[PDB]
Design a protein around this nucleic acid. Structure first.
Length: 863
RNA sequence: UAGAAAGACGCGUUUUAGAGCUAGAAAUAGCAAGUUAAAAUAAGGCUAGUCCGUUAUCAACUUGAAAAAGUGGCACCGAGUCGGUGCUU
DNA sequence: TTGTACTGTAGCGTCTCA
DNA sequence: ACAGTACAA
C-alpha cells in the first residue's frame, strides 16, 4: 500500500525506481497493446530514461544575428541602388540587373555575362587599368576628372557593403596625421592610424587604398622574383608550387583553400635552403610577403576611414553629377548609420524579441530614424525588460547638493529616488538629459550638467507547459526537470493515483527544484528529500555494490534505487538488507532512449562545388546543384514507414514494396502539410494513407532471439541491447584497479588487494560471456575472432591492465553507436549497421516515458 | 564558473566575370598569368516588417483546428533482459 | 542492376552594451 | 551520420 520513488537527475539520464518498505522493487504484469501475439508482459518497477542533452540558445542567437546582419546589408545596397537608379537608367538600365545576375551561368543570365560593361573589350580594359577595386577607389579619390557612374557606384558599393567597425566614437579624419588637449587627441589619432595603416609617403585622402595598392605591387614584384629564382635554381618544384592546387603551394594559396600561415610554413623551408632570399625571409617574418587585400586582419579598420574616402569621392564628383550634390548627406548617412543597441529589431509587433516603440508609423529608414522612433521609450524598455522582479550616498550626494541638511530633506524625496533611478538605468548623455528634463526648474544649469555624469551601477535585491515555461535557468538543464515531472506523473498514474509517501531526488539549482516540485502538492492535485550524492557515494563503498560505468546503463536505475533506500533509511531513523543484494542483481531494467524528432539546421554548412551527384541540396530554388553546387549531409527529422507500389525496370512493373524513408527537416513542413502528395512526388504510387507510421530517431525494434536494434536514421541503426553481468564479476573488475587509493588503510584492507588473484578465472569466464552475448545480439564475427586472438596473445599480462582493457572491451557491447576502442595495443574498428531491411519485418516497440506501458506493432502483418 | 537578449565587424565557402599563348591528328608538353569584384550565406514564410525561420515542447490509442483532457488488476515463487501459477470481473 | 566493406568529411574569429 | 570508392552478386 506504500511505495517510494527514487530519482537520479542528470543532463542526459533520469533514473527511476519504485521501492516498498522492505526495499523490494515490485514486479507487475502489464497489458501490452498492438497486433502481436502477446497481451501481457512482466516487467520490474525500476528503470532509467535516456535522452540527448538539451541545447543552449547561443547558436540560434548567433545565427539569428547573422541573418539580421545580411538582411540589413542587402538593404543598404538596395537604398544605394534606389538612389542611383534614376540616373543610371539613362546609361545602363541593365547594370543592376547584371549585378544581381552575376551568379548565374552564361545560359541562365538574361543579359551579357560581363557585369560592369556588358562587352568583352571594355571589361578586359577595366581590369587591366584597375587590377583591384582599391586601384579604382584611389583613382576616384585622387583624380579630379569626370568618372563614369558605374565606376563610382562600384567604389561606393564596395565602401558601404564592407564599411568597417564602429569601435571609434569621434571623427578620426584620415588626413589628420600618420592646446595640449587637441595635440594629444591628434597624436592619439596618429597612434591608432599607425596601428591601422603602415606608411603613406605621398599625401592623399585615400591612405587605405594607397597602402593596399603598395601591398598589391609588392606581391606582384615578389611573385616575379620567386618565379625567376625558382626557375634559375629548382626547376623540378616549379610544377609543384605554381601549378598543383592540392600541395599547399602558391597555387594552393590562391586557387586552393590554403590560408596565409600554412602557405608561409610550407614555403619557409623552400626559401631557407635555396639562396638569395634574405629579403624574402625578413618579409615572411613580418607576415608581409605575398599578402592579399581581403584578409582576416582587416577587422581593425574603423568606418571613419571609409567614410572619409566616400566623402572625398563625392566632393570630387559633385559638380559633374549634381545629383550626388543633392543627396550627399544621404549616402554619408547610409555608411554612418547603425541601429542603436537599445532600440532592438525594428519590428511592428511581430517579433518575440523586439521591444521598440515608434511615433509615426512610416517605414523606418536611415534618414527618418530619429523622427519616427521613440528613443526614450525604446531605451527604457531595453533596460526594464531584463531586470528581475522581487522574489555611501550620504557622503556622496553631499558633493552635488553642497549641503548635508538638504540631503536630509524628507518631503520631496520621491523624485529624489527617481533621479537616482534614472542615472542607474540610463547611460547616453543626451538621453540621460532627456529623462532628467523633469527636474530642470529645481536647480541651476551647471549642477545638473555636472550631475548627469553621476553614473550608478548595481541593483539591490495553469497548464504544466506554461507552469514550467516561466521558470528561470538554461533551456539545456530544464530538460531533466520536464522529464522527471512527467515520470512522476506516470508513476502516480500507474498505481491508481496513490501518492507516494516519500520521493527521493539528487546545488542551488536543485535547491530550487525541491521547492518547484514541492509546489505540486497544492498546484497540480510526497515528502521530498534533498539527498546529497555523498551519502550514496560512501554507502556504495561501505558495501560490495561497486559500479563500473563503462559496462551498461543499468547503474542509473541502480543509483535511483540507492537514492530511495538511503532516503527512506535516513527518515526512518572548530529481511530488507537481505533483499537489496537480490535486487541489485536483477537482469531486467526498463531502459528507454527517448524517441525525439530532430530539429535544427538543414545540413552541414559547407557549400560543396558543382558535381554530377544527385545528393547535392539545391541551396536556392532556381540554383540547380548540378551547375551551382550546394549542401550535403541533410539532417533527417524522422523516418516514415511507407508501403506502396514502385515501378522498377526498363519494362516497368507495379511491384509492391515496404520500406522506410527519411524526412529531412525542411521537408517536414511540406510532408505534414500533405503526406500522400509529398510521397507521390518522391515516386511512390497508391500509398496506404492509414498504414503510414511515423518513426522518430531512437525508435526501438525488437528482432528474433531477443535482439533489439535502435533506429538512428532511415539508413542507419544502433545497438539496442544491454548485457548484465553478475555482481561478482563487477566486483572483481572494480577491485582489480585503483590500488593507490582503494584500501584507505594500509593493512586491514589487504584482502581487497588479494581478492583478484584468487578469482583470476572470472576474467576467462567473462570472455566467454562476451562472446556468447555477441553471438546473441551483436552478430559480429571477424571482430570477435580478432578480440579472441588478441586476448589469447596477451592473457598473461598483469591483472590491473588486463581488467582495465576488459573494461575497455565493453564498447563492443554498450548501448548506442559502435565505436573504436584500443583494448591493449590494437584498434578494434567498429562496424556500421547500414541495413534497415531487417527491421521492416521486426517488432516495433512504442515505450511509455517510464517504459512500463508498451505497444508492440508487428510490422510483418502490415502490407 | 556559467545563463538570456540587442547592435556590429572581418574572413571563409559557392557560381560567374577577370579573352591564356605556342607546338599540336591528339593524348598531352613547354611558356605566360595568379592578389580583385558581383551575388547568396540556412530552402523560404506571411501578419509584408530594414519582421520571422537551428532554443524549448514531442511513446501508442480515443476526443479536441489546436490548446487541452482521457485510455492499461492483484498476491506469490523464481530470474539470460523477464517466466509461470492462482484470485478477480 | 543492388547490396556490402573500407576510407574520408564535418564554419569561424573578434568585439560593444544593462 | 552521411558520402564516395571499390567490388560481390
Amino acid at each position: 500500500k506504500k511505495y517510494s520513488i527514487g530519482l537520479d537527475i542528470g543532463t542526459n539520464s533520469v533514473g527511476w525506481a519504485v521501492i516498498t518498505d522492505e526495499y523490494k522493487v515490485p514486479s507487475k504484469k502489464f497489458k501490452v497493446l498492438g497486433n502481436t501475439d502477446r497481451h501481457s508482459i512482466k516487467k520490474n518497477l525500476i528503470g532509467a530514461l535516456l535522452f540527448d542533452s538539451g541545447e543552449t540558445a547561443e547558436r540560434t542567437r548567433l545565427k539569428r544575428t547573422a541573418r539580421r546582419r545580411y538582411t540589413r546589408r542587402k538593404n543598404r545596397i538596395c537604398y544605394l541602388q534606389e538612389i542611383f537608379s534614376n540616373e543610371m537608367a539613362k546609361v545602363d538600365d541593365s547594370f543592376f540587373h547584371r549585378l544581381e545576375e552575376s551568379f548565374l551561368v552564361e545560359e541562365d543570365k538574361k543579359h551579357e555575362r560581363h557585369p560592369i560593361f556588358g562587352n568583352i573589350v571594355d571589361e578586359v580594359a577595366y581590369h587591366e587599368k584597375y587590377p583591384t577595386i582599391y586601384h579604382l577607389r584611389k583613382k576616384l579619390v585622387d583624380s579630379t576628372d569626370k568618372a563614369d557612374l558605374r565606376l563610382i557606384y562600384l567604389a561606393l558599393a564596395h565602401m558601404i557593403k564592407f564599411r568597417g567597425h564602429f569601435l571609434i566614437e569621434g571623427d578620426l579624419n584620415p588626413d589628420n596625421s600618420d592646446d595640449l588637449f587637441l595635440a594629444a587627441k591628434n597624436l592619439s589619432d596618429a597612434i591608432l592610424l599607425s596601428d591601422i595603416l603602415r606608411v603613406n609617403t605621398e599625401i592623399t585622402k585615400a591612405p587605405l587604398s594607397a597602402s593596399m595598392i603598395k601591398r598589391y605591387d609588392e606581391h606582384h614584384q615578389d611573385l616575379t622574383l620567386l618565379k625567376a629564382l625558382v626557375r634559375q635554381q629548382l626547376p623540378e618544384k616549379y610544377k609543384e608550387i605554381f601549378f598543383d592546387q592540392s600541395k599547399n603551394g602558391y597555387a594552393g594559396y590562391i586557387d586552393g583553400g590554403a590560408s596565409q600561415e600554412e602557405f608561409y610554413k610550407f614555403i619557409k623551408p623552400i626559401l631557407e635552403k635555396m639562396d638569395g632570399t634574405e629579403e624574402l625571409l625578413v618579409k615572411l617574418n613580418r607576415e608581409d610577403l605575398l599578402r592579399k587585400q581581403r584578409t582576416f586582419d582587416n577587422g581593425s579598420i574603423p568606418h571613419q576611414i571609409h567614410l572619409g574616402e566616400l566623402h572625398a569621392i563625392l566632393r570630387r564628383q559633385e559638380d559633374f553629377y549634381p545629383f550626388l550634390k543633392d543627396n550627399r548627406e544621404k549616402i554619408e548617412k547610409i555608411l554612418t548609420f547603425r541601429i542603436p543597441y537599445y532600440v532592438g529589431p525594428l519590428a511592428r509587433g511581430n517579433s518575440r524579441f523586439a521591444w521598440m516603440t515608434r511615433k509615426s508609423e512610416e517605414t523606418i529608414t536611415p534618414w527618418n530614424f530619429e523622427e519616427v522612433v521613440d528613443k526614450g521609450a525604446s531605451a527604457q524598455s531595453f533596460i526594464e525588460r531584463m531586470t528581475n522582479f522581487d522574489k555611501g550616498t550620504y557622503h556622496d550626494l553631499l558633493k552635488i547638493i553642497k549641503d548635508k541638511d538638504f540631503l536630509d530633506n524628507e518631503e520631496n524625496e520621491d523624485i529624489l529616488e527617481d533621479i537616482v533611478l534614472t542615472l542607474t538605468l540610463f547611460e547616453d548623455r543626451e538621453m540621460i538629459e532627456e529623462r532628467l528634463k523633469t527636474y530642470a526648474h529645481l536647480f541651476d544649469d551647471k549642477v545638473m550638467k555636472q550631475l548627469k555624469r553621476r553614473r550608478y551601477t548595481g541593483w539591490g535585491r495553469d497548464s504544466l507547459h506554461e507552469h514550467i515555461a516561466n521558470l528561470a535557468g538554461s533551456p539545456a538543464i530544464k530538460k531533466g526537470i520536464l522529464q522527471t515531472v512527467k515520470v512522476v506523473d506516470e508513476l502516480v498514474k500507474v498505481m491508481g493515483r496513490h501518492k507516494p509517501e516519500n520521493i527521493v531526488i539528487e546545488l542551488v539549482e536543485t535547491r530550487q527544484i525541491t521547492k518547484h516540485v514541492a509546489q505540486i502538492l497544492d498546484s497540480r492535485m510526497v515528502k521530498v528529500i534533498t539527498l546529497k550524492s555523498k551519502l550514496v557515494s560512501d554507502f556504495r563503498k561501505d558495501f560490495q555494490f561497486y559500479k563500473v560505468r563503462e559496462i551498461n546503463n543499468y547503474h542509473h536505475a541502480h543509483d535511483a534505487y540507492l537514492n530511495a533506500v538511503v532516503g527512506t533509511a535516513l527518515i526512518k531513523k572548530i529481511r530488507d538488507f537481505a533483499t537489496v543484494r537480490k535486487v541489485l542483481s536483477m537482469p531486467q531494467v526498463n531502459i528507454v532512449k527517448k524517441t525525439e524528432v530532430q530539429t535544427g539546421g538543414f545540413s552541414k554548412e559547407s557549400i560543396r562545388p558543382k558535381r554530377n551527384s544527385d545528393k547535392l541540396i539545391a541551396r536556392k530554388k532556381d540554383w540547380d546543384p548540378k551547375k551551382y553546387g550546394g549542401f550535403l549531409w541533410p539532417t533527417v527529422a524522422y523516418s516514415v514507414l511507407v508501403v506502396a507500389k514502385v515501378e522498377k525496370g526498363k519494362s516497368k512493373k507495379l511491384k509492391s514494396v515496404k520500406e522506410l524513408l527519411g524526412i529531412t527537416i525542411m521537408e517536414r513542413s511540406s510532408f505534414e502539410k500533405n503526406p500522400i502528395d509529398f510521397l507521390e512526388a518522391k515516386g511512390y504510387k497508391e500509398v496506404k494513407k492509414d498504414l503510414i507510421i511515423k518513426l522518430p530517431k531512437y525508435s526501438l525494434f525488437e528482432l528474433e532471439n531477443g535482439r533489439k536494434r535502435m533506429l538512428a536514421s532511415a539508413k542507419q541503426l544502433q545497438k539496442g541491447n544491454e548485457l548484465a553481468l553478475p555482481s561478482k564479476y563487477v566486483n572483481f573488475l572494480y577491485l582489480a584497479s585503483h590500488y593507490e587509493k582503494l584500501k584507505g588503510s594500509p593493512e586491514d584492507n589487504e584482502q581487497k588487494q588479494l581478492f583478484v588473484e584468487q578469482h583470476k578465472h572470472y576474467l576467462d569466464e567473462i570472455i566467454e560471456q562476451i562472446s556468447e552475448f555477441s553471438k546473441r545480439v551483436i552478430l559480429a564475427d571477424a571482430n570477435l575472432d580478432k578480440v579472441l586472438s588478441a586476448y589469447n596473445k596477451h592473457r598473461d599480462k598483469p591483472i590491473r591492465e588486463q581488467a582495465e582493457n576488459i573494461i575497455h572491451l565493453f564498447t563492443l557491447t554498450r548501448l548506442g553507436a559502435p565505436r573504436a576502442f584500443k583494448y591493449f595495443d590494437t584498434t578494434i574498428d567498429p562496424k556500421q549497421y547500414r541495413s534497415t531491411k531487417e527491421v521492416l519485418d521486426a517488432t516495433l516497440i512504442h515505450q511509455s516515458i517510464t517504459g512500463l506501458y508498451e505497444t508492440r506493432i508487428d510490422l510483418s502483418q502490415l502490407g
